[PDB]
């Protein structure tokens, strides 16, 4: 499944990254080895976050209709904004519209009105993955 | 030694559990006991290897991987079952000591051990295997001694002894010298009682991989098989066959002192346990077939239905189709009380223009008759078409091979006069007779002949006599029951119908 | 069993034998004649995505499913004698998918017990050929021609895993 | 029958997936099957015409309770199975294009809707890459950093070029000893090798 | 006694310890072999020499004695790396020592390791040798066993458990065996002294080295050179072998598919056929159709519909050679044939036998005849069956058999025999001096569009992937044209056997596009190209 | 290495026939019909009548086994998983207790016939089933040192028996078997029938018995415990007299032995 | 978005990255104790307060970074010695089902230290390279026995290393999933 976003941790980490970058620039403009350690540590820190966010976006691609259906359910025990970050919300929303426009014009424009829905649960095969 | 008894017990439990084998034992026994009071069925049973798997896996794998230690006790238990069931009293002298137990055979699901002569390998020795191929050679049948009985002149006591050889038993024993004892332990002179002694039949064959599987024009490979008792003479050369048996080795392999420096290998064989043919003709009717056949026969016009169902891909020629159907049914062969014979089988000839489906229609009979041989008229000689000499031995031709069948001859007009006259006997007396250096014999050839030809002028000429168009002697045309002339007459609607038909086809 | 899965899309198109329980006008196009009715006790071969519904919707439903040849008794005996030697690829390209679909449809108990053993026994040799890395081709290639489309994916993702580890270690 | 064209179309999806998976460097997704897709859509239009005619016969009263219900229902299934095939095929080619968009952020094989789709998704990627979270290069390398300094050899004569760390002069078959964090992009572009 | 244990210990420690950089190459190979049930090890001489030269010295002095010790050492290691039963493992060797020419082997080389090369000319069937063997003692009925190994033995005579002079027999029911095979090696053709026929040797291999080569292949061999019993005090030499040396991808069919959608593909293939020959457009078109062929079909009543094509040509020598090169399978012959079988087949003699000519031998492929007028008398009549039926049938001198003749015939010459062919054409010439000068300049150069292999592979791909069917429009068109020509001839012959030829040409034309249906576009070109006259 | 992790009446009879034979040890429970009572008793009675008839005709064990074994599948099945067969066997034995506890002659005849049937069925077992059945009855082997010290006497005692009873004509085979054979030590009075035939070795009042013999101890324990249970059954016959519907059946069953 | 080979698993590079975050003991050849390091994912005091030839503990990636130059020397872990590896092999042979209790990163750390720090061992390195191999071979036998218990419910493993698990992950999970699908389909 897609696990809930750590809202607080990410705020604090990203602020710390910015401050460390400015400190490295100030010391550089001011023995070599401590600078080497600082530079490569910042690389090691940034790699983990990059991998993590790419994985989460990949999960959002695969469960887009499921997340939308979970949000549309007024009786849901959790809101979509609890689960996703603001950037993730933007990506999910606009990517769904792009994909929808592509298939709607290309295929579904030609189908009869009973089969024009994209997120149909009632058909002979369920169109929603989870 | 004690393990042999437990294996006999375990197979007895199997025979009690799966009851369809008891019915088989009992039915063979009661059938043989009935006609004996007036053919006889063999003392052999075929077991499904799947039943044995579901009954006891430890016995199943034992039969299939260590047959020398599991087949003998199982076979012993079968004999005890058949012996305990009721049997006719007061047996004769030969029956009392026949030395004739019952024997097993197998079917179903051999798995990895289903093989071919190319792939049979030294890893498979002493395993139970199934092989497939073509029979290429067969030995003469010979009798073999296994037990002899003797009467002692003074004491009035009957004595006996048993013999063994390496191909007679799955397990291995000290060989026996094939000598008859002349004198008793106590010095009494003995006599041999033939008719109370027991002899069995023996035959060796050879099986080769099918030519369809031969790689790269390489030499083909083959195996020798040993048959005995009931299995003798159930095959002939050219048969496609599937054989079941134990794969085994023999002899001293040159380790008994020899000049070879032991580079030569040991000899090997398959001991025939069961043999099955392959279809590569006959069918057996079920009850439903008899019902359907009898019901269909009461339609008003069965002849039209059946005749039009022959070669539906060929348009027209209704009457020739009807004639072919009547040929396939045939008349009735008569033998009168004074030995005189009256013919029953129908011969048909058809002659006509180019492209008018003569060869195409002739080809259909070859794929619906139960026995059929095909030949072209110029590719065959008179002796090859009837019989020829070799070494003295006399060898059959095509008309002798299709005895109770049909022979198809295409391009009949190209056959030379010297070849045609060999056929005049076969189409009426239905025999072939040879009188050549060192040979005189008669052979049977009862078939029906169907053939196709081209007219003399390349197309049929209505403005000349039929004898001018058909260059064959009157004595030969007389032997064909129906002679059909067919032509390609140009007409609009006929052309349209035929062309649309072949395009739909 | 996802919607957009190509293998599931492709496996649902295999045909199964069927028999009708009502005569119906105009549906002769199933019998490749649009101008005629279907008649009761007619037998036809239909794709599974259609037969799976016509066997259920009513009472008596429109179609009855006949036992297909790929689940015949001969195949079961072949499976139970030696599962490793068996040429499942020739029997049917998508065997373990159709097996699960048929089990769900009829809730078979014994077929599940046969199929579970078949999979478990073939996984062993599949791992053997996955583990064996060169520092051979014929010995491996003879068995890898008898794998299902289902089994090939497991073999590929195993071989790559072992190979990546080996490459990293000896580097 | 109405599913044959779909069963033929999906085989191209399986084929292009295997061709793509075999060689990650050689991505050129093949010609869009405009003609087969057009034939499938024409078949759907034929089925729609048949249902409409059947509705006219239903309003005329032609045994509509059983006959129109069964014929209509059977027709509906034939349309749904065609929708599934078309969506599966288009979804596969979409996944391939999304994969290329992340690295790149030529056109002739893509259908025009796909040609605008790719541009839209590139706009989305650069929107995420900008703004907040800009400090981490979301389109950068996914392999963990092993070493700070490496030796790289000069494979293509791109001449003198500029980069955020400085300027380089790529004299063919010269060799640099330099930090990887700088030359990672040039290695990906293909001017350099690690030796 | 102890030397047998020290040597085994030494080779055991060799396998357990030889690293080159960071991988224990022989431990890894031995483990990876067991997982695929391969019980052997391929050692390399140079590594053995590098590890310890003394071991190699012992091996080089007495190979017959020391090879078995190294084999049992391999077994002892194989158990440790896989068990917390196995046969004895086969040792295999690789070497780079100087090759000896086969003609120079002599009495100085007996019982030495030798490396040589040549051509394999014959292969025996497999035969069985014993390794573990069980014995029964005839008098006391005591039992024992023996372990053979195959290096240069007889049954013993020390009776046990008096017990007699020669009491032992074999229990074949409880013994183990292996495979053995014989081969013949002939010296290299480019080595033989002039005016002499090549010399050859006989040799043996067992277990995994069996069934590894086929006749006619050039090979390199490593083995012990030795003698065996079979003049005075004289013996035959031989060799014991220890080592031997001797469908489409996706990226391929993508090119073939790109060719298939080219709007001028028919022109491209015609242009690619014998490009040096000037003019003769329709000849080239007909050869494309002959190479591509129609589609075979089988009906419910069992009748069978032909797929092949047949063409006749009345300069012409070059095209048959080109067809022979481009075709996936091909046979070339002149009208008299390669033997008394002629083109078709014949019976020969002493018992009689039968052999087939170059119609039976080309079954499944293409055959081309260089002068069809030089056909023999028997072949003149027999080719009718070979072409109409795709069979040859004989019933002569007690032989009674039928032969398959499934092939497409190309023929040339300089009568009624023309009726057998689908198309007939007459070759045409032009006399441009530049053409001859260009040919002459190329001849001097050697004395001082699509390529063939790509086209052959494309033809193979199309034959494997597609077999197209007539559309209804084509059927109406063809039938209307057929009745039109017959009516025109009637008011002034065409026959069904030629309509069924036009259909095959039509299918072959649709096959290039890989279109599953044939269309009026193809029918038009088919009847247009039908103008043989 | 990898690692994972009334009904009572039916279970009772499954337990009682896991060994395939029983000493008939325990009180039955639940219900069966009166027709079943009569028929089951008569079936076992027919088998025991034929056993006593053959013994009165002085036929051997092999002949009696040939005569009686076909009757199990019809009257009283053996080596069977069926709950009905197991209940039929068990209940029929218990019924004939109540029929044949009534007098010393009836008790002796029933004990003799039932013990011989026990012997027959024990012979039908596999050696594994025999071992498991003996072990289930909670039924002293000598040490290897004592066997070695007495090896000459024990081998002299059993060598003829090994040849005639186990067909070991070869002395080599007899020696190998004797090397593998175990021996039991017990007071000589417990195996006195083997003592009178000099089939066991005697030392200091103890008899030394090989493991391939000694089935007479098992059958004698069966006979003795059955006799004691019949004596007990006799003592509480006044409680049987509370259901009149059973007494005619028991009188009929006993009349064939009087 | 994410590569196909990283959908369900970690590559060996990520496994090396994970192992590199552990602490290790070193001897420095320089004194830093009175610029400063100012790290943000670790302690900073240890590196700022080094004294020459005084033992101290730091993360492994910095330790290898120092050992690239003269300024540092790495102490081998105590389990990575001939005596301990002998005892672990004896444990492996004695208990034919249990796995011996080696640390979760033993393979990775051995094959890092043999490359970067071949000079700092006390034992002869050509013996350690043999005993590591013996351990891996015995453990592979035990793994091959265990793959006959894949089932519909669960499995227990003990002391199996991270790299050893990651090697097997895509096989075990896939076959187990399909057995689960086959079983539950019969219930429904
Ligand atoms: N209804 C039909 N009438 C005539 N010919 C047909 C018909 N249907 C198919 N044919 C074709 O006619 C062709 C020639 O048939 P065939 O039987 O060889 O003629 P034929 O009488 O043997 N001519 P020939 O070989 O010159 O003596 C074959 O290719 C058949 O497929
Ligand atoms: Mg013809
Ligand atoms: Zn002896």
Residue numbers in the entry:
A (entry chain F): 75 to 104, 122 to 221
B (entry chain 3): 18 to 55, 90 to 331, 338 to 448, 455 to 568
C (entry chain E): 1 to 58, 68 to 144, 158 to 193
D (entry chain C): 1 to 105, 119 to 208
E (entry chain 5): 21 to 104, 131 to 198, 205 to 213, 235 to 303, 320 to 335, 348 to 415, 421 to 455, 460 to 524, ...
F (entry chain A): 1 to 5, 44 to 177, 181 to 299
G (entry chain D): 2 to 35, 48 to 201
From the paper:
Pol α-primase is a constitutive heterotetramer composed of a dimeric primase (PRIM1 and PRIM2 in H. sapiens [human], Pri1 and Pri2 in budding yeast) and a dimeric DNA polymerase (POLA1 and POLA2 in human, Pol1 and Pol12 in budding yeast). During eukaryotic DNA replication, Pol α-primase generates primers at replication origins to start leading-strand synthesis and every few hundred nucleotides during discontinuous lagging-strand replication. Pol α-primase binds directly to the leading edge of the CMG (CDC45-MCM-GINS) replicative helicase via a complex interaction network. The non-catalytic PRIM2/Pri2 subunit forms two interfaces with CMG that are critical for in vitro DNA replication and yeast cell growth. These interactions position the primase catalytic subunit PRIM1/Pri1 directly above the exit channel for lagging-strand template single-stranded DNA (ssDNA), revealing why priming occurs efficiently only on the lagging-strand template and elucidating a mechanism for Pol α-primase to overcome competition from RPA to initiate primer synthesis.
To assemble budding yeast replisomes associated with Pol α-primase for cryo-EM analysis, CMG was bound to a model replication fork containing a 39 nt 3′ flap, onto which CMG loads, and a 60 nt 5′ ssDNA flap to mimic the unwound lagging-strand template. Fork-bound CMG was incubated with Pol α-primase and the replisome accessory factors Mrc1 and Tof1-Csm3. Although Ctf4 was not included in replisome reconstitutions, we identified a 3D class containing both Pol α-primase and Ctf4. The presence of Ctf4 likely resulted from endogenous Ctf4 co-purifying with CMG due to the extensive interface between the two complexes. Comparison of the structures with and without Ctf4 revealed no substantial changes in the conformation of Pol α-primase. In budding yeast, Pol α-primase is tethered to replisome progression complexes (RPCs) via interaction between its Pol1 subunit and Ctf4, a trimeric scaffold protein that binds directly to CMG. Although we see no evidence for the presence of multiple copies of Pol α-primase in our dataset, density for Pol1CIP was observed on two Ctf4 monomers (the third monomer is bound to the Sld5 CIP box), suggesting mixed occupancy within our reconstructions. Thus, Pol1CIP can bind to either Ctf4 monomer while Pol α-primase is associated with CMG (labeled sites ei and eii in Figure 2A), presumably because the CIP box is linked to Pol1exo via ∼200 aa of largely unstructured polypeptide.
